[PDB]
């Protein structure tokens, strides 16, 4: 019953660290570590974490090794330095996940009952794509379909702390993106707010034409999850929109009509005071 997780801006920096702590000699091209958290009531929080030596062979894709003794000491070391933080799960990077992630999860559920994984992106960082989290659930599948795992998605957000947010602003120092914007940042928030829109909409038809052909089998779960999108968008016809839209559009044109009136008197007064001061310095210089 996880609503959402809160990833502090510290742990992903430790992943980017440990993505570079192995890349000098390692060709593993995935980083698997241990996620520590603070399960408060219903929302999940992640403050600190660490990593663990893990490898995986591409042949037979079922062989793995976790270091339990390093997990027992270092989590026990963190408990002594901070008896607030505890285990909440694990994490791995790489978009394409290997299939030992059920085998890793079902082992370390002996540590955490509500075990959770967090997928981050180190290289796919160009578009708007945050970190990703799933959940460990065990059902059959749907009704009469064969049994499997089916990691369900839990939505994720990012939240800092008081020093963890003020220390960020001192680091950037390049554009800094001020609060409430002066008509230039706000339009770009609608520009790149829409650049991610059709990128989702191109992605829907790409999976749809993949399954309209029939290569991969269908999932009925996504069908009605897509079907309530199209028969719940509004249709603007008469007396519910076209009356009520002008009632707030002809409302907001009255107050910008003051901006036409007031700002014209502002620059006119600055014109008068300069044309007085110009001709009076001119007539008295000679």
């Amino acid at each position: 019953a996880v609503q959402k997780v809160v990833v502090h801006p510290l742990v992903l920096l430790s992943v980017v660290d440990h993505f570079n702590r192995i890349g000098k000699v390692g060709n593993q091209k995935r980083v698997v570590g241990v996620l520590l958290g603070s399960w408060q009531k219903k929302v999940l929080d992640v403050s600190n974490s660490f990593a663990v030596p893990f490898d995986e062979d591409d042949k037979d894709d079922s062989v793995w090794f976790l270091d339990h003794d390093y997990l027992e000491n270092m989590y026990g070391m963190f408990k002594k330095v901070n008896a607030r933080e505890r285990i909440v799960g694990w994490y791995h990077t790489g978009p394409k996940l290997h299939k030992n992630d059920i085998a890793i999860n079902e082992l370390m559920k002996r540590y955490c009952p509500n075990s959770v994984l967090v997928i981050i992106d180190v290289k796919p960082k160009d578009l708007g794509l945050p970190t990703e989290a799933y959940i460990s659930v065990e059902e059959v599948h749907d009704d009469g379909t064969p049994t499997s795992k089916t990691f369900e998605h839990v939505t994720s957000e990012i939240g800092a702390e008081e020093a963890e947010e003020v220390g960020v602003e001192h680091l950037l120092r390049d554009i800094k993106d001020t609060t409430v914007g002066t008509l230039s940042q706000r339009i770009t928030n609608q520009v790149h707010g829409l650049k991610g829109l059709n990128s989702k909409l191109l992605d829907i038809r790409s999976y749809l034409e993949k399954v309209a052909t029939g290569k991969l089998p269908i999932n009925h779960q996504i069908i009605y999850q897509l079907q309530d999108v199209f028969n719940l968008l509004p249709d603007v016809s008469l007396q519910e929109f076209v009356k009520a839209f002008y009632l707030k559009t002809n409302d907001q044109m009255v107050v910008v009509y003051l901006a036409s009136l007031i700002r014209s008197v502002v620059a006119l007064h600055n014109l008068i005071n300069n044309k007085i001061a110009n001709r009076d310095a001119e007539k008295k210089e000679g």
Binding site: V254, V255, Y257, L261, I262, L268, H269, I272, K275, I276
Partner: protein, 52 residues
């Protein structure tokens, strides 16, 4: 005497009770801003007349 909201009809003998919109504050406040901008331009006019 504003003790009742409605309207009468003589051609049909039909009483019709209706409602009114709110008195909205944001509109006639701007009516009073025009009176100030009318006076400061009047203040700028004889200023520009008295000295060019």
């Amino acid at each position: 005497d504003k003790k009742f909201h409605g309207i009468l009809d003589q051609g049909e003998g039909v009483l019709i009770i209706f409602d009114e919109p709110p008195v909205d504050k944001t509109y006639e406040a701007a009516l009073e801003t025009i009176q100030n901008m009318s006076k400061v331009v009047d203040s700028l006019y004889n200023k520009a007349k008295k000295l060019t």
